[PDB]
Design a protein around this motif. Structure first.
Motif, PDB file in Angstrom:
ATOM      1  N   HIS A  43      -4.288  15.258   2.535  1.00  0.00           N
ATOM      2  CA  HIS A  43      -5.207  14.050   2.664  1.00  0.00           C
ATOM      3  C   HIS A  43      -4.188  12.726   2.883  1.00  0.00           C
ATOM      4  O   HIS A  43      -4.448  12.027   3.798  1.00  0.00           O
ATOM      5  CB  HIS A  43      -6.153  14.046   1.662  1.00  0.00           C
ATOM      6  CG  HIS A  43      -7.475  15.010   1.696  1.00  0.00           C
ATOM      7  ND1 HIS A  43      -8.766  14.391   2.246  1.00  0.00           N
ATOM      8  CD2 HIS A  43      -7.643  15.934   1.868  1.00  0.00           C
ATOM      9  CE1 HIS A  43      -9.628  15.370   2.352  1.00  0.00           C
ATOM     10  NE2 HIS A  43      -8.865  16.238   2.042  1.00  0.00           N
ATOM     11  N   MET A  44      -3.342  13.063   2.111  1.00  0.00           N
ATOM     12  CA  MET A  44      -2.357  11.427   1.721  1.00  0.00           C
ATOM     13  C   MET A  44      -1.727  11.872   3.451  1.00  0.00           C
ATOM     14  O   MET A  44      -1.173  10.706   3.827  1.00  0.00           O
ATOM     15  CB  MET A  44      -1.173  11.598   1.104  1.00  0.00           C
ATOM     16  CG  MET A  44      -2.146  11.854  -0.342  1.00  0.00           C
ATOM     17  SD  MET A  44      -2.479   9.942  -0.757  1.00  0.00           S
ATOM     18  CE  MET A  44      -4.137  10.288  -1.155  1.00  0.00           C
ATOM     19  N   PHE A  91       2.570   7.370  -6.134  1.00  0.00           N
ATOM     20  CA  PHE A  91       1.456   8.579  -6.230  1.00  0.00           C
ATOM     21  C   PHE A  91       2.046   9.820  -5.853  1.00  0.00           C
ATOM     22  O   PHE A  91       2.152  10.909  -6.530  1.00  0.00           O
ATOM     23  CB  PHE A  91       0.332   8.417  -5.418  1.00  0.00           C
ATOM     24  CG  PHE A  91      -0.859   9.153  -5.551  1.00  0.00           C
ATOM     25  CD1 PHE A  91      -1.060   9.725  -6.854  1.00  0.00           C
ATOM     26  CD2 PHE A  91      -1.641   9.933  -4.436  1.00  0.00           C
ATOM     27  CE1 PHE A  91      -2.104  11.004  -6.782  1.00  0.00           C
ATOM     28  CE2 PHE A  91      -2.244  10.935  -4.469  1.00  0.00           C
ATOM     29  CZ  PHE A  91      -2.839  11.326  -5.646  1.00  0.00           C
ATOM     30  N   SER A 110       0.694  -1.055   0.062  1.00  0.00           N
ATOM     31  CA  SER A 110       0.045   0.062  -0.141  1.00  0.00           C
ATOM     32  C   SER A 110       0.548   1.113   0.048  1.00  0.00           C
ATOM     33  O   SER A 110       0.581   2.241  -0.916  1.00  0.00           O
ATOM     34  CB  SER A 110      -0.736  -0.165   1.219  1.00  0.00           C
ATOM     35  OG  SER A 110      -0.039  -0.515   2.486  1.00  0.00           O
ATOM     36  N   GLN A 113      -4.294  19.874  -1.692  1.00  0.00           N
ATOM     37  CA  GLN A 113      -5.377  19.346  -0.957  1.00  0.00           C
ATOM     38  C   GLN A 113      -5.107  17.837  -0.717  1.00  0.00           C
ATOM     39  O   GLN A 113      -5.160  17.248   0.563  1.00  0.00           O
ATOM     40  CB  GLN A 113      -6.715  19.647  -1.149  1.00  0.00           C
ATOM     41  CG  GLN A 113      -7.216  21.052  -0.692  1.00  0.00           C
ATOM     42  CD  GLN A 113      -7.020  21.145   0.782  1.00  0.00           C
ATOM     43  OE1 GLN A 113      -5.963  21.837   1.402  1.00  0.00           O
ATOM     44  NE2 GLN A 113      -7.916  20.563   1.549  1.00  0.00           N
ATOM     45  N   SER A 114      -4.786  17.292  -1.803  1.00  0.00           N
ATOM     46  CA  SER A 114      -4.352  15.911  -1.943  1.00  0.00           C
ATOM     47  C   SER A 114      -3.132  15.589  -1.007  1.00  0.00           C
ATOM     48  O   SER A 114      -3.255  14.395  -0.480  1.00  0.00           O
ATOM     49  CB  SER A 114      -4.288  15.462  -3.290  1.00  0.00           C
ATOM     50  OG  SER A 114      -4.048  14.059  -3.620  1.00  0.00           O
ATOM     51  N   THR A 174       2.564   2.066  -3.041  1.00  0.00           N
ATOM     52  CA  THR A 174       1.375   2.595  -3.993  1.00  0.00           C
ATOM     53  C   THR A 174       1.253   3.984  -3.477  1.00  0.00           C
ATOM     54  O   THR A 174       1.092   4.886  -4.627  1.00  0.00           O
ATOM     55  CB  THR A 174       0.130   1.879  -3.939  1.00  0.00           C
ATOM     56  OG1 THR A 174       0.342   0.593  -3.681  1.00  0.00           O
ATOM     57  CG2 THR A 174      -0.721   2.110  -4.965  1.00  0.00           C
ATOM     58  N   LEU A 197       2.579  13.274  -7.873  1.00  0.00           N
ATOM     59  CA  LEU A 197       1.881  14.638  -7.517  1.00  0.00           C
ATOM     60  C   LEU A 197       3.158  15.635  -7.614  1.00  0.00           C
ATOM     61  O   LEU A 197       3.020  16.819  -7.987  1.00  0.00           O
ATOM     62  CB  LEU A 197       1.397  14.537  -6.119  1.00  0.00           C
ATOM     63  CG  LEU A 197       0.349  13.838  -5.804  1.00  0.00           C
ATOM     64  CD1 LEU A 197      -0.122  13.931  -4.294  1.00  0.00           C
ATOM     65  CD2 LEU A 197      -0.748  14.622  -6.379  1.00  0.00           C
ATOM     66  N   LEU A 224      -3.388   9.633   6.113  1.00  0.00           N
ATOM     67  CA  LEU A 224      -3.524   8.540   6.056  1.00  0.00           C
ATOM     68  C   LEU A 224      -2.271   7.840   6.306  1.00  0.00           C
ATOM     69  O   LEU A 224      -2.392   6.696   6.948  1.00  0.00           O
ATOM     70  CB  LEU A 224      -3.958   8.072   4.632  1.00  0.00           C
ATOM     71  CG  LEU A 224      -5.426   8.473   4.231  1.00  0.00           C
ATOM     72  CD1 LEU A 224      -5.499   9.098   2.613  1.00  0.00           C
ATOM     73  CD2 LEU A 224      -6.192   7.259   4.085  1.00  0.00           C
ATOM     74  N   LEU A 270      -3.972  19.849  -5.731  1.00  0.00           N
ATOM     75  CA  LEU A 270      -2.913  18.965  -5.469  1.00  0.00           C
ATOM     76  C   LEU A 270      -2.442  19.255  -3.960  1.00  0.00           C
ATOM     77  O   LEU A 270      -1.906  18.317  -3.282  1.00  0.00           O
ATOM     78  CB  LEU A 270      -1.815  19.064  -6.482  1.00  0.00           C
ATOM     79  CG  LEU A 270      -2.148  18.393  -7.864  1.00  0.00           C
ATOM     80  CD1 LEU A 270      -0.765  18.206  -8.895  1.00  0.00           C
ATOM     81  CD2 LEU A 270      -3.053  17.364  -7.584  1.00  0.00           C
ATOM     82  N   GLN A 277      -1.861   8.318  10.364  1.00  0.00           N
ATOM     83  CA  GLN A 277      -2.414   7.258  11.171  1.00  0.00           C
ATOM     84  C   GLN A 277      -1.923   5.905  11.029  1.00  0.00           C
ATOM     85  O   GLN A 277      -1.931   5.053  11.955  1.00  0.00           O
ATOM     86  CB  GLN A 277      -3.793   7.057  10.632  1.00  0.00           C
ATOM     87  CG  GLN A 277      -5.018   7.887  11.678  1.00  0.00           C
ATOM     88  CD  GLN A 277      -6.344   7.592  11.324  1.00  0.00           C
ATOM     89  OE1 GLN A 277      -6.606   6.888  10.454  1.00  0.00           O
ATOM     90  NE2 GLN A 277      -7.188   8.511  11.893  1.00  0.00           N
ATOM     91  N   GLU A 278      -1.143   5.602  10.054  1.00  0.00           N
ATOM     92  CA  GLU A 278      -0.386   4.097   9.617  1.00  0.00           C
ATOM     93  C   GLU A 278       0.665   4.075  10.479  1.00  0.00           C
ATOM     94  O   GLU A 278       0.759   3.084  11.033  1.00  0.00           O
ATOM     95  CB  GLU A 278      -0.294   4.410   8.143  1.00  0.00           C
ATOM     96  CG  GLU A 278      -0.358   2.631   7.663  1.00  0.00           C
ATOM     97  CD  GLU A 278      -1.837   2.398   7.785  1.00  0.00           C
ATOM     98  OE1 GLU A 278      -2.738   2.794   8.009  1.00  0.00           O
ATOM     99  OE2 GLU A 278      -1.497   0.952   7.734  1.00  0.00           O
TER     100      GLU A 278
END
Ligand code: NA
Lengths: 66, 66
Positions: free
Chosen positions: A57-58, A28, A21, A53-54, A24, A32, A61, A51, A64-65
């Motif tokens: 968001h990443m 990505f 993951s 904003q993206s 990936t 970007l 994620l 972008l 938290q991981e």
């Protein structure tokens, strides 16, 4: 770098989880950066914001991981 | 398909933007489908949830654009 630097910090940060993951997310985030450099030359500020904003968001994620 | 059909729903909406940034979301969306199908065969289910979350952030990023 601004956008690139935070993405590369996410590339580094995520590179230490070494999972599928995450490899990936790394691919990505690398894309970007490449897209961001072009849109900065193009002067497309709506997509530059999109972008950014993206990127935030990443970050939530992959915060938290880890 | 569960994950895939919604990812295809996000691909469809991203294609109607006709933007450089949207071709990076589509490329990435295809990669999520391929990665999701992969570890799904392994039964590595913690990561399938993580990809489900990334799909739901993608779903909330493309919502401003339209
Ligand atoms: Na990608």
């Amino acid at each position: 770098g601004e956008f690139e630097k935070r993405a590369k910090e996410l590339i580094e940060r995520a590179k230490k989880l070494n999972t599928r993951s995450a490899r990936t997310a790394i691919v990505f985030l690398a894309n970007l950066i490449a897209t961001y450099k072009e849109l900065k030359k193009e002067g497309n500020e709506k997509e530059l914001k999109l972008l950014q904003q993206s990127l935030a968001h990443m970050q939530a994620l992959l915060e938290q991981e880890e």
